[PDB]
Design a protein around this ligand. Structure first.
Ligand SMILES: Cc1cc2nc3c(=O)[nH]c(=O)nc-3n(C[C@H](O)[C@H](O)[C@H](O)COP(=O)(O)OP(=O)(O)OC[C@H]3O[C@@H](n4cnc5c(N)ncnc54)[C@H](O)[C@@H]3O)c2cc1C
Ligand code: HEM
Ligand SMILES: *[C@@H]1O[C@H](CO)[C@@H](O)[C@H](O)[C@H]1NC(C)=O
Ligand SMILES: *[C@@H]1O[C@H](CO)[C@@H](O)[C@H](O)[C@H]1NC(C)=O
Ligand SMILES: *[C@@H]1O[C@H](CO)[C@@H](O)[C@H](O)[C@H]1NC(C)=O
Ligand SMILES: *[C@@H]1O[C@H](CO)[C@@H](O)[C@H](O)[C@H]1NC(C)=O
Ligand SMILES: *[C@@H]1O[C@H](CO)[C@@H](O)[C@H](O)[C@H]1NC(C)=O
Ligand SMILES: *[C@@H]1O[C@H](CO)[C@@H](O)[C@H](O)[C@H]1NC(C)=O
Ligand SMILES: *[C@@H]1O[C@H](CO)[C@@H](O)[C@H](O)[C@H]1NC(C)=O
Ligand SMILES: *[C@H]1O[C@H](CO)[C@@H](O)[C@H](O)[C@@H]1O
Ligand SMILES: *[C@H]1O[C@H](CO)[C@@H](O)[C@H](O)[C@@H]1O
Ligand SMILES: [Mg+2]
Ligand SMILES: [Mg+2]
Ligand SMILES: [Mg+2]
Ligand SMILES: [Pt+2]
Ligand SMILES: [Pt+2]
Ligand SMILES: [Pt+2]
Ligand SMILES: [Pt+2]
Ligand SMILES: [Pt+2]
Ligand SMILES: [Pt+2]
Ligand SMILES: [Pt+2]
Ligand SMILES: [Pt+2]
Ligand SMILES: [Pt+2]
Ligand SMILES: [Pt+2]
Ligand SMILES: [Pt+2]
Ligand SMILES: [Pt+2]
Length: 805
């Protein structure tokens, strides 16, 4: 009621002010008025206002202020204020009821003088012309300044307005932070001779912009207090899912964090073509729909990499063709160290094949479809003396061999880890699943990981830090070849220059200190199958589209799938003809594996129908390696290609094609589109560019290589034979990134088998125990526990020695 006098320090203007108490609102609220010289006698039509308002939390630019001029919200002119960008915006509103007020169409105008914004308050000094009398529709109101005083209402809110930069279009909910009104009465200072000079300082103006609605926000859930896990696995995928289940059989608490959203039907996925609406099936569930990922991939695939990777539950297993194979045991013999050889891995290979047996006849009616294309090549090959084997039992015949396509499917829908391992895991109470949640890095005190930092990627997901239960807790990185290498780098584990790139980013202030960095060759030894395409034609080739089966599917086949789980839709797009294999000895005395897959599709210039493309995959035995690195904002890039470096790698690719022509030489009516018949094989291979767009197989591997040679000693291995990161207590990597090289076939089978094997070694490892005072807690050769008994701290003594002190 009684006015406080307040002189503005900046502009020099004297206000009458009225404030609210600390109970009425928090952060505080103050109004002020400045009137003309004659104002205490005759009614003034204008005034100079002052607003000091509050931002409590949401606290940078947020909240809004209001004033009602005869004080009730209704049938009076409202003035509404709020910060955005660091400026202050206002709007003149008029409310009839106690719903959201409209814009005031009338002669009232606000022009600014001075403004302030900071973490506590936002200030405004403005000038209101023609604001003391109003009309809207049929409503007359006003206040007489000679009374002497006025009724004033006020409000304050916690959230900032929607469309906060476009005043005409703003969106509000009811005022949170407080409300009330005064009996405010005037005195000496509200009428000043200096007034008309004060109102010429109204020159200032603010720039609004409309631009439409906003998609940016991502509201998140903060991480539960007093919760921890025995194992935390990062990412659902070929490695992630199977390892999380097998850990969860132990009874220990397991959490699985995944950046993606729900993928298949069973797990709550919604993405479908318009003709799957009336079922629970989803585009990831139908095999014949699997190639649409090359047409519309948005939000399905990772934005932080220059390559194709699924960010969805099941990762690669959700977007791939589903090809499944009993692993060739020689691949383990050649690639892996001891404990991972063919004989050690035999146990876990049967366990994986029991949960996911795979099938050569995905259709549940019992036989195959559009096999005429398959037939041409199949018979043409045994004519040159090749041998049909079943790729699901004697896996040992990879030389001059073909087989029927073999999938991971179960009941004619996409099979694999999502349909088996992740179901039997969800049934358990210890198991928990978090989606739409990105892991930024692991948190660690020295070589011991305490917990992991998460950031909500999409809405459902979580922000903040989850701990592992202490001293025993373990983290497993399953986030894929590029994803896992990235997490390590951001965790201060990797080559120096890459860590510097991280330190120089927006991650840097919060990043681990470099006193604790671990030098490992993360990102080195990048490797991929080397893919090369050839094209043939025959009149026997039956083409099926599959791309417009999205929109306008064949009705006999749609009804055949939906009703019976049969028809062409139960096998992979595109229709995948025979798989065949050849091993080749080079002049360097290495045997390089070839893996051919044939699908009935057109390639570079050869139109679809009559056409079969034959993709050669250069596998195990290839010597060439690349490297992965980080962009300045921490995108993963392939800066060194692993394709056709060694001249003997290229020799084998060329050989393969020659041998294939000789073996298809006697077949009726067989064209060769590529290489065209005027062209030699070597000439063709050489015209193919060696570039990841031309030659990549999407089988990326090896960026944290497993080996017995510690990286910190100038060896090549990031993780040891138990899949644990050198220099660490609790930190493991289970996924394609540990493979020292590519296997014969498509890697998903090899990865799940490998996840089975690792979860057994991990579990077999003795519990971790804190190091006593004076004990050895670290340095470049140290393999033991990295954490001290409390209060004691790990401290560095030499350049080579850390002890608990
Ligand atoms: C286009 C394509 C086609 C393929 N076709 C075949 C095929 O026909 N046959 C075959 O056998 N294999 C195929 N694969 C290859 C095979 O799927 C991959 O090698 C396999 O998926 C590797 O599994 P992974 O667990 O190592 O990584 P992924 O399977 O990619 O799983 C990684 C998971 O971790 C999650 N993640 C990543 N970053 C984070 C983060 N920081 N925080 C939390 N979670 C994160 C990802 O979202 C993803 O879900 C294909 C792959 C692709 C990309
Ligand atoms: C959509 C946003 C808004 C909603 C839902 C809203 C709703 C309300 C409701 C329901 C009441 C009191 C209930 C009652 O009297 O029974 C109220 C009171 C009030 N409102 Fe509004 N309001 C909104 C925006 C504003 C604006 C823009 C102003 C003025 C700047 C404002 C100023 C007031 C004041 C001063 C009071 C207390 C005095 C009174 O009862 O009139 N509100 N608000
Ligand atoms: C923010 O501004 C308000 C008034 O405009 C002032 O009271 C407060 O001290 C300022 N905050 C800081 C941190 O200076
Ligand atoms: C399928 O569902 C989507 C989801 O809203 C809808 O947009 C589409 O029209 C539906 N198609 C039908 C019912 O044929
Ligand atoms: C082409 O198809 C016909 C029947 O459709 C078959 O008799 C013939 O053997 C096929 N050609 C080859 C090369 O298999
Ligand atoms: C693969 O088969 C070819 C042809 O029979 C033969 O020349 C080659 O030595 C074989 N390689 C191996 C490793 O058996
Ligand atoms: C660690 O960082 C500081 C600057 O942040 C730098 O001066 C120091 O040399 C770094 N340590 C090493 C070993 O380079
Ligand atoms: C749809 O597929 C069936 C085979 O199941 C075929 O007989 C029919 O002709 C196809 N329809 C069209 C329009 O091609
Ligand atoms: C587990 O945590 C507490 C507090 O964080 C610590 O004092 C205790 O020593 C830790 N466990 C062991 C075995 O030291
Ligand atoms: C985290 O918080 C969100 C709200 O933004 C919830 O919708 C979600 O269920 C999760 O618990
Ligand atoms: C973290 O805060 C939660 C609030 O949900 C409590 O339940 C818990 O005891 C801890 O203080
Ligand atoms: Mg309130
Ligand atoms: Mg494939
Ligand atoms: Mg770049
Ligand atoms: Pt006076
Ligand atoms: Pt505007
Ligand atoms: Pt929980
Ligand atoms: Pt869609
Ligand atoms: Pt060998
Ligand atoms: Pt469930
Ligand atoms: Pt913590
Ligand atoms: Pt149906
Ligand atoms: Pt080379
Ligand atoms: Pt591609
Ligand atoms: Pt074991
Ligand atoms: Pt070290």
């Amino acid at each position: 009621t009684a006015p406080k006098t307040f002189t503005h320090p900046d502009t020099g203007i004297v206000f009458n002010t009225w404030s609210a108490s600390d109970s009425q609102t928090k952060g505080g609220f103050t109004v002020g008025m400045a009137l003309p010289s004659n104002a205490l006698t005759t009614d003034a039509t204008e005034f100079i206002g002052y607003l000091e308002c509050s931002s409590a939390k949401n606290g940078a630019n947020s909240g809004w202020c209001g004033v009602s001029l005869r004080g009730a919200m209704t049938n009076n002119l409202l003035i509404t204020a709020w910060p955005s960008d660091g400026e202050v915006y206002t709007n003149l509103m008029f409310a009839t009821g106690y719903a959201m007020p409209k814009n005031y169409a009338g002669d009232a105008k606000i022009t600014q003088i001075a403004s302030s914004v900071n973490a506590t308050h936002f200030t405004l000094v403005f000038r209101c012309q023609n604001c003391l009398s109003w009309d809207q529709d049929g409503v007359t109101g006003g206040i007489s300044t000679s009374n002497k005083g006025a009724q004033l209402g006020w409000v304050q809110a916690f959230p900032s307005p929607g469309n906060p930069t476009c005043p005409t279009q703003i969106t509000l909910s009811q005022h949170d932070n407080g409300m009330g009104q005064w009996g405010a009465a005037f005195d000496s200072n509200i009428a000043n001779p200096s007034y008309t000079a004060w109102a010429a300082k109204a020159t200032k103006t603010v720039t609004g912009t409309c631009s439409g609605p906003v998609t940016t926000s991502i509201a998140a859930t903060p991480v539960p207090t007093g919760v921890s896990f025995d194992y935390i696995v990062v990412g659902g995928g070929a490695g992630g899912i199977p390892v999380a289940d097998k850990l969860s059989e132990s009874g220990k608490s397991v959490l699985l964090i995944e950046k993606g959203f729900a993928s298949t039907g069973e797990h709550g996925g919604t993405l479908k073509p318009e003709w799957l609406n009336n079922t629970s099936l989803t585009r990831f569930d139908v095999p014949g729909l699997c190639n649409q990922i090359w047409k519309d991939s948005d939000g399905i695939a990772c934005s932080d990499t220059d390559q194709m990777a699924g960010c969805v539950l099941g990762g690669g297993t959700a977007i791939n063709a589903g090809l499944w194979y009993k692993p060739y045991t020689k691949d383990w013999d050649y690639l892996f160290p001891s404990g991972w050889k063919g004989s050690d891995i035999a146990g876990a290979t049967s366990r994986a094949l029991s949960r996911i047996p795979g099938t050569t006849t995905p259709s549940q009616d019992g036989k195959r479809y559009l096999q005429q294309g398959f037939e041409v090549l199949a018979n043409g090959l045994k004519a040159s003396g090749w041998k049909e084997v079943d790729s699901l039992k004697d896996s040992e015949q990879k030389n001059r061999t073909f087989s029927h396509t073999s999938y991971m499917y179960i009941n004619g829908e996409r099979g694999g880890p999502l349909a088996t391992y992740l179901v039997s895991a969800k049934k358990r109470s210890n198991f928990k699943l978090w989606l739409n949640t990105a892991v930024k890095r692991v948190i660690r005190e020295g070589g011991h990981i305490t917990g992991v930092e998460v950031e909500a990627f999409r809405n459902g997901g979580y922000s903040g830090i989850i701990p592992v239960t202490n001293t025993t807790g373990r983290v497993v990185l399953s986030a894929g070849t590029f994803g896992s290498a990235k997490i390590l780098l951001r965790s201060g584990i990797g080559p120096k220059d890459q860590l510097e790139v991280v330190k120089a980013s927006a991650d840097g202030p919060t990043m681990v200190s470099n006193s604790s960095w671990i030098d490992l060759p993360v990102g080195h030894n990048l490797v991929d199958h080397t893919n090369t395409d050839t094209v043939i034609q025959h009149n026997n080739v039956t083409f099926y589209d599959f791309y417009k089966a999205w929109d306008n599917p064949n009705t006999t086949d749609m009804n055949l799938y939906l009703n019976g789980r049969s028809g062409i839709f139960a096998q992979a797009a595109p229709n995948i003809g025979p798989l065949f294999w050849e091993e080749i000895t080079g002049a360097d005395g290495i045997v390089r594996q070839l893996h051919w897959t044939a699908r009935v599709e057109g390639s570079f210039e050869t139109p679809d129908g009559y056409a079969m493309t034959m993709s050669q995959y250069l596998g195990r035995g290839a010597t060439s390696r690349g490297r992965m690195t980080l962009s300045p904002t921490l995108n993963t890039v392939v800066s060194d290609l692993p394709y056709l470096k060694d001249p003997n790698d290229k020799a084998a690719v060329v050989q393969g094609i020659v041998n294939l022509q000789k073996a298809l030489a006697n077949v009726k009516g067989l064209t060769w589109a590529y290489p065209s018949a005027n062209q030699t094989a070597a000439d063709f291979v050489d015209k193919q560019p060696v570039t990841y767009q031309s030659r990549r197989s999407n089988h990326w591997m090896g960026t944290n290589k497993m080996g017995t040679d510690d990286g910190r000693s100038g060896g090549t291995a990031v993780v040891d034979t138990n899949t644990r990161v050198y220099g660490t207590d609790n930190l493991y990597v289970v996924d394609a990134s540990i493979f020292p090289g590519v296997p014969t076939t498509n890697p998903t089978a090899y990865i799940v088998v490998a996840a089975e094997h690792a979860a057994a070694k991990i579990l077999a490892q003795p519990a971790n125990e804190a190091v006593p005072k004076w004990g050895w807690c670290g340095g470049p050769t140290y393999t033991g526990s990295q954490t001290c008994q409390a209060p004691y701290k790990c401290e560095k003594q030499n350049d080579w020695y850390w002890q608990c002190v």
